[model samples]
Target chain A: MDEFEMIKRNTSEIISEEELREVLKKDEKSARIGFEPSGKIHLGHYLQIKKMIDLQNAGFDIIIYLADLGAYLNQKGELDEIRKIGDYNKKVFEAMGLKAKYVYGSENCLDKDYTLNVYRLALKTTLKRARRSMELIAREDENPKVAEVIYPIMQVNNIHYSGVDVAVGGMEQRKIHMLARELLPKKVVCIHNPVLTGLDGEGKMSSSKGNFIAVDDSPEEIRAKIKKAYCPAGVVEGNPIMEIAKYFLEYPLTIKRPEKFGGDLTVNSYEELESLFKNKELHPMDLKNAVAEELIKILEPIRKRL
Target chain B: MDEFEMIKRNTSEIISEEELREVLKKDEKSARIGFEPSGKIHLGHYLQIKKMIDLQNAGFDIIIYLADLGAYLNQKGELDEIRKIGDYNKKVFEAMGLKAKYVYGSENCLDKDYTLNVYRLALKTTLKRARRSMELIAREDENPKVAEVIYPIMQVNNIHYSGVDVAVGGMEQRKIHMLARELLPKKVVCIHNPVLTGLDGEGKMSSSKGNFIAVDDSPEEIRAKIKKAYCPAGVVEGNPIMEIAKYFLEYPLTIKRPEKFGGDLTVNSYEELESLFKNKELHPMDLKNAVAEELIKILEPIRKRL
Candidate 1:
């Protein structure tokens, strides 16, 4: 893969691939992604880790910001506890085998200049605009708190203040990233990774739902969750099992079964597996176990480091 | 009036006169009022000065907060210009013969503790609630800025941070004061003085419309503005002349006139002038000149100090 495809791997969308190409031309181009740091890393977040690794290999410096303060404001945890969680998450991120600089929003956001820029961004954004950006990200409430709107403002400024040339996140962050682009004079490339379907076979996977497999999930736990995950036969769209299969597709996928079941199938690529799953040649249980089997191996290094 | 009545005089409402009595019981109680310092102090602000004088006489330590930074955030002016205006306002407050500690929001609001508190207040207060409090005070706009909402949070924190036992402002400030009461644990007496009518007899007295008489207005400017003021004969309601008369209510209001127009009359008090004027016997010019004449004297000390 060229520098472009290397850094752009697995992303659902790039705001502008041309702009990204221009950004990649810089000797020290940068990209960043932020998470609330409220729970252990999960498969829902692992695809983003892989993207960061690809960007690192493509010579783009990556920033992983643990948004502990955002989580605290959102009422996830207390300040000290949130910082502790951030530190643990930083170690977990390092263990994921990605090379990146880690920033705690609490440590960097409290500075007068950064906070003043937060205020500046807040002023530039309206209530409706700010709230719209958080529709996918914020916890739903009948009467949302002011902090809900404020969190998005902070997120927008987070990109500018951290000095990132490109920003990365799941599709849920699209509205906020677009808002940042509109407000900031300097251009920032936005890379959006696909959001994995929740284990419940419903919406996106999230920490609050417990519908995700943590990065450090034991082999038994992986087997249990995969067995429980909703994987409809002959359907590929919104299928968690196929999504994982695509993300972790490696050379020579081997499925061993008895002669009556068409004993052995050798998969060369993710697309072939997806094609097989969509064609119903791959049973739901077979696909689920294969993805789970691969995930346990993929997550093994992280577990060992932790 | 004794200690209690002196501080309580001229106020439209005290959130609780009981709370006020309790505050007055303190050996060293404190009170404060805040202003944006964007204009020259006028009769609109003079009422507050008299209240401060009353509180000073009633054994209260006073604080006059020059909210220059608040004004700057509101986009009234830049920081240096606003601070320069604040310096002018502090001198004006002293010139009005009210001995009080002067404060600058810029000086006190930039600390980590204060900005953090501002963020906390922002979290607790809603957009609707915060904007509602600003209805009577904030300059109107189609889309209110985030800085507009931030200023009120700072104002609420201003009372608690300044150690004010009582918070004072005109009726226009009632909503914000009520918000402070709802937010703070300690009880702070809220004194709302009556808002003066504009000389045009439209809305409240404000510097924006040039419908107010400055505390340092020369005798000539005083006479000229009063003569052109909207004060219809026989109708004291919403009359700027009568409003000033009520503010400067003193014994023996001497109305000098030629014999045809009911000669020199010695009005005992504001109520007598209101009664006689309502009866249409006391002409508009007669009342206008008398109030203007008295205002010149009332403002003498301020002009000298300025």
Candidate 2:
């Protein structure tokens, strides 16, 4: 496959597909993703990181921005402690096999020249517009703080200041990236990976709600979380179990069983499983159990190291 | 007069008289005024400088903040150029007999610790409130730029970061200083000098309207500008000539004449002139001409250096 296919696979969006194509032609060397690094690294973060690994393999220099200072500015923690958390998050990313270059918000964000650009961007931006762009990414739910608007502008500046060509994040980051693109047109392309639903089936999987299986979860914990995940019978949509299968169930997947349960079974591709499940040929309990086992298998070594 | 009386002279408003009383007991050592340093220093600026000087004489070390970074952020000029303008303004301030320490926005505002405070203040601030504080201070009048909102927060940061005990400016600066006071309650006492009116018989004296006389105005130009100034007969209120008289006319002010319109007259006090002018005892031309000559004397040496 070509670079574009490699970079775009498993992704939900490429804001300007043409820009991705254009960037691909130049043998693009750099792409980036910013994280507040204030939360636990979970399966959802794993998905985004996995995509970055793909971009890395596709000859793109991946940038993992540890947004500690931004978190500090948002009143998350002390600058020293926020950076400590950022360091911890980066360590977790390494354990998950994310081999990429990194920069900490504390390392370069306070550069005299960088802050000047921040001031320039802030001057042009309105609070409403900045806040709207942050509707999904901001930590504050109601009465969001000024740092919410400020960090988005900083994210935009991150793209320019770091000189990255492709900016990547989960689908929730789309609006902020859009504002960044508008803040500076033709400077970078935003690639957003599809967001993973939570086990509770209400919203996106996040550490705040404790609805996620952290990257360091033990095999049994992964199994337990997946077992209780919201997987409805005869439904192909909004199913966390199926979503896990889609993300973690590789080919040659198997379902072990006793003779009374129609013996052992073999599941084909991800698409084939979805179809069988949608047709009700497979039960929600079986799908949930199988995904749990597969996830435990996949996460064993990664969990052991963390 | 006591220190409190000296610092309070010629000032229009103090955010809290009680705060001034409190600061007085402590033998306050610092007061400040922030300027864009983007243009010529005019009488309006001189009025503020005069206040800063008053603070200096009252046992306070005055700080003159050269807002070069803010001017650049607001599109006034490039950094080097803005700093150059900032340097020029300071020289003129010294020529006008202002002796104070100086700080540049770029020199210290970008300090990591300092910017963190700015972000902290920005988060709590609403866009409307921030914009309202800048109603009179911004250079971009219509469709005021984002830099407009950002600068006030910087102003607040400057107050605390510089450790100013008294914040000084003209009436237009009161709102912004009020915000700084609110941002850090009980830290700085705000003192606002009365704003001077424009010679065009219009709004407040501002460089944008070209209704101001620069500190470098030549003697003849000072006389000429005052001659055509909008001074209606015997109007004590909102008269630019009378306003100049209020500022520049020395005690025992003399309006020399040939006894045709009126014999040479001596006015002892500001209240006497205002009452005499109010009662139509003085001709508008004589009032305009005397203020013209006195301003020439006041600005002559300052203009010579420029």
Candidate 3:
């Protein structure tokens, strides 16, 4: 499976060649991306960054808006946490050699005039739409604060004001992106990516849970991490590491897999990989090892740069 | 009518003196009043401003916050209207010798750090609660732009961040004020004034309809406006001028009717005048004339200064 195939398999609900083409066509020059700086940037962020880089390489302008403001207000003067997350995230972007104008802190984005605009936009949005963005915040947070509810509106406003042709975030952000589509001027497009799970085979990938692999992880660390992976045999689901390999590794490899290793696999079709894996000829460990090796090769420069 | 009687007749549905007393008793000196500069300050605004002055004279610290940012973005480029309204409103306050510290605009309010805090708060609120604000905007606007929908959340944020102990606005703002009550930190209070109708006895007084009377109107203009008021004979319902007389003139008069008037009216009782009017013992024309004359005298110096 390749990038196209992985996108298809993981996000059958929102992904399609037509949708991607539409995103590409409209966002021919640039796309502005936003993420909450509540914690360290993980592989989930990397996937989105990769998508952005792909889009940028394809001739689109790119902007990464660090949600420092959202983090600060939601966290309530937790300046130290915000700074740590911001610094680490900057390192990640720099490691990846990601090229785009960076907006790190809310101080960098929301001036008095901008905030007034935000308030104005918040007033215009319905409570229902604003709450939809808070579903995750509501669940994760026992005492969900007012800031959680308002975050979505601000995010929507960010897209509206940035004049971005397209907005990209994890699938959990589908609600907010949908809101942007509905509430924003009909001119902008929304692009949502699938969420990546943690290496611990838990919920989503999170650094706090120690269930994520940083790009700077050494090759041995990568191998050890895979060796400790919780993949089950003869099963299509519940294996976070194998899932990563199937989606991020073998998939991309099969498409761009060097001819020297093996004949070019049908990277455009997931069905081909499913048939090969189902026959037991493609062992999960073999797939994991290949993923680890390739991941190291891909991440070595990023790691050294960091 | 006295304040008690006026409260019983018009505001019985929304508030009671007991509740007001409880609120007033809680650091009464710190209570402040505010309004959004979303439109030109009309006659309805005059009534509210007068109430602010009364509250201020009663020893409450008055602080007026101009919702400039919310107005600008919510109205989107229609900011010229807010500037005009705000300028006239400032003049009215100044003319009254009211000493409220004028917080001119949202620009001053949402200065960088404040905006960051608001963004954080917005992130905390749910999309559901935020959408409720949009419903109001949707009714008046076509296709209802996003800024219009999100203004309520921003408004709620305004009260919360301003450190205001109490918020006052027309009843139409009840929903958002209620939202603020639910969303703001526990320290803030919400108070809503009854909606004022047009002098023509039609719907809410709106400058757009040219149905408002400015405080700066000349005595002759005030008299002519009252004379042309659409109060129906023997019917009190929907009578704007009658409501104004009862709420503004009679109620305030009951508190301190000038000693110079030859009538035996006492400052402590409103029932004497009501009874006089009810029996047709006091001619309606005379009452209207008296109310108009008193209103002119009250507003005269304020108008002259402006």
Candidate 4:
């Protein structure tokens, strides 16, 4: 596979392939993604982190922004508590094999130029656009806080001030990324990974919902979660197990089964897995076991860090 | 008048007279009023400045916050242009006999503690409340900018960080001042002066409406503006001439008139002016002449500063 294809592997969309191609040729390239320090890093986070690794391998610098101040304003906790969480977040991302520069959003966000730009961008952004951009991420409330709008403007400036060539996020970040593309003085290439299906098979995987698999889950916990995870037979869409298998598993997967059921199945591609699952040749139990085992192997190193 | 009454004279509202009474007893007190430096200083601005003088005589240090950064964000002009206007505004206020410590909003607004407090205030303020607080000040738009809400939060922080014991603004600022009173960690006594009527009598005297008499307006310009100004007979409500006369004119105002028209009239107080005007005994033309003449004398000193 070509560099572009490798970077694009198991992803949802890139804003523009042509713009990304140009960014690839730059001598010094950088990308950034931010995390709220209040939450545990999970599989959903890993998807984006893996994308960062792909970008890193393609010779791009990575920035992991610890949004401690944002978390504090978000009512997550006090600054000291949030910073502790941010410190833990840094360790987890590092343990996941990501070599990157870490920035606390509070550090640069408090700079004079950075704050003036926040006001500048606030003037440029309409309340309608800001409110709409926060549709996916803002806490549900009858009356949204002003921070809901300002945070997005801050995010745009964050991308600008980080000096990154690329911004990476899940598809939920698409609206904010779109706003940044329109508002920034210069263009930033955007890479959007797909939102992970929650283990409940309803809604996106999120910490608030507790429908996510944390990256440091024990092997037994991984198996227990997979055993109960929603994966209906002969279903290819909105299947959490299938999504996990397709996005996280390596190619040429071998699914072991009893001789009475179809001796161990060897699937070389996601398309092959989908076809077999839809044809009922692969049982749900067998598929769940394979996913649980693979995830255990994938997450053990992260667990070792703690 | 006692110091409290002197401070209360010509003002429309004080959040709490009891609170203000306590503020008057402070050994070293301070008060602040902000101005956007993008436009010419006019009677409306003077009304607030005069109130600052009142506060000063009542034993309070005055702070004139030049909102240059706000002006730049509001699309007034470049920063350099706005700062130039701010310098001119400071000179005009000085000429108006206000002994104030001038502060450009940009200087401290960019500070770390100040900017973070802005975020903290943003989190505490709701969108509904912020938008409503801006109803009087925001430019008319089908869709308001995010700055409309953020500027108010910034205003609240401005008051908080300035360490001022009192905040002064026109009646139009009552809502924001009320918001600050509710949000500030420590209580701030609020002084809301009357909103000046524009010469057109249809709205508040404002630069954008071109119905204001600038402080630096030549005597000829003041006379011409007052000559054509709106003043209806037997009505004091929404009457620009009466409003100006009531708020700005000194006591024992003398209106010179021809012998055929009730001769020269000497009004000892605003109440006497209101009574005569309500009774249709005083002619609109005669009242216009006296206001124009008094304003000319009151504003000549400021014009000389230029």
Give the number of the best model, judged by TM-score: 4
Please give the DockQ score of every candidate, comma-separated: 0.46, 0.37, 0.24, 0.70
Docking class of 3: acceptable
**With candidate 4 superimposed using the best TM-score fit, by how many Å does residue B51's alpha carbon deviate from the native?**
1.5
Question: Highest lDDT, which number?
Answer: 4
- What C-alpha lDDT, on a 0 to 100 scale, does residue B110 get in candidate 4? 74
Residue range B1-306, candidate 1, lDDT tens digits: 578887777778998999888887789888888888957788878888889888888888888888876777676767778899899888888887877788786656366676667667766787788778888777766777666677677788888787778899989788888888988877678999998999999998887777989888889999999999999988888988988898865768788788988888998777788889889988898888778888888888778877
Per-residue lDDT over B82-119 for candidate 3, one digit per residue giving the tens place of the 0 to 100 score: 76777667777777677787776634545566555455
lDDT of 3 by residue, A90-130 (tens): 77887887878887654554655566555566556754566
Each model's TM-score, in the order given?
Answer: 0.93, 0.87, 0.65, 0.96
Q: Between which residue pairs do clashes occur in model 2?
A: A123-B146, A123-B147, A146-B123
- Candidate 3's DockQ: 0.24
Model 1: residue A298 alpha-carbon error in angstroms: 1.4
lDDT-better candidate, 2 vs 3: 2
Q: Considering chain A alone, report the TM-score of candidate 2 relative to the true chain A.
A: 0.94
**Stretches > 4 Å off in candidate 1:** A256-258
Task: Give lDDT: candidate 1, residue B253.
Answer: 77
Off by over 4 Å in 4: none
In CAPRI terms, model 4 is classed as medium
lDDT, candidate 2, B1-306, per-residue tens: 877787777778887788888877775468888888847778889888877887777778888988887787666867888888899998998998888888887687477777777788877776677777777777655455556667778878778777767888778777777777677855678898888999988988877677898889777788888887888886777888888788766898888877788789998999999998888898888887788888888888898877
Assess candidate 2 and give its TM-score to the true structure: 0.87
